[model samples]
Target: HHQMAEEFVQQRLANNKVTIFVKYTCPFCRNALDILNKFSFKRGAYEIVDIKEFKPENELRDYFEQITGGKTVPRIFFGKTSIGGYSDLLEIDNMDALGDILSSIGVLRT
Candidate 1:
């Protein structure tokens, strides 16, 4: 199941431009979603997964800690690389900086 969770996370990161592992009612996750929504990413360019919907929520959080150094929701990824959680995003409070970061990762189109 651990391996399965790892594979699941890997697949999402591999397949999406931007991916966020979230809890539906988490304020931080909601904030992350709102911030990302401010950008002009096309449909399907990014994906938001509700961790509760998956059976291996705990395993997934453990995997997140191992890979991204944290096991918290709003675990944001750019392609296959993790940019950490909301606090990381908080550092990038400006839209233009966010755009540059997204564009650099090939997640945001011009």
Candidate 2:
């Protein structure tokens, strides 16, 4: 079951330009989602992978560790770049850097 969840995460990530690996019930996750929702329809793309529901512990851990060098929740990746977790995301948001990033990734239409 856990392996299945991991595969799902990988599949989702591959299928979307922006993949947010999050754990439900996490305040950081909620904050990230809020930011994503606000920027919806940018470049017409966005994806969120909630580990809590996927239930693939090993695969999820492996994927996160491989990308982040550690197992962490709320880990976000833009294409293949590691975007760190919620605090990092919040920093980008606070600095208004997210817009540029979204635009760069072609996630924002304009």
Candidate 3:
């Protein structure tokens, strides 16, 4: 049910430093993965889960689509915040923020 999916999403958000939901074949997902990679290490800061692996079956759509406000691949998140899709991350990928935003989130340093 929808409740289960929401709980799953919540757990993922809280349990990792950065988590990206993606598909194996999406170019947008690929690019987003690259950015996600740039922001982390091999052991401590990322979980790139293929959305196809967990997407609900026998349903018209997956709960992530609803959770993220769109069904697109590469739904990137920073801790509990939805950093958004590939396009949006492309912006964050370029702008480290106004400093405060980045630092507050540990995306930048003083």
Candidate with more favorable, higher lDDT: 1 or 3? 1
Give per-residue CA lDDT, model 3, range 1-106, as digits (tens): 4546566566666433677777789899888777655543434455777656554632313665666677666777777777778888878657765233434555
**Cα-based RMSD of candidate 3:** 3.9
Where does candidate 1 have its weakest 10-residue lDDT segment?
Answer: 1-10
TM-score of 1: 0.85
lDDT of 2: 0.73
Candidate 3 residue pairs in backbone clash: none
Candidate 2 regions exceeding 4 Å error are 1-6, 14-16, 42-44, 56-59
Better of 1 and 3 by TM-score: 1
List per-prediction Cα lDDT, in the order shown. 0.80, 0.73, 0.63
- Give all candidate RMSDs, comma-separated: 2.3, 2.8, 3.9
lDDT of 1 by residue, 52-95 (tens): 86666777888899999998798998888888999788778654
- Worst ten-residue run, lDDT, model 3? 101-110
Ranking by lDDT: 1, 2, 3
Candidate 3 — which residues are off by over 4 angstroms?
1-3, 55-62, 98-103, 106-110
Cα lDDT, model 2, residue 56: 49
Ranking of all candidate structures by their TM-score, best first: 1, 2, 3
Q: Number of the top candidate by lDDT?
A: 1
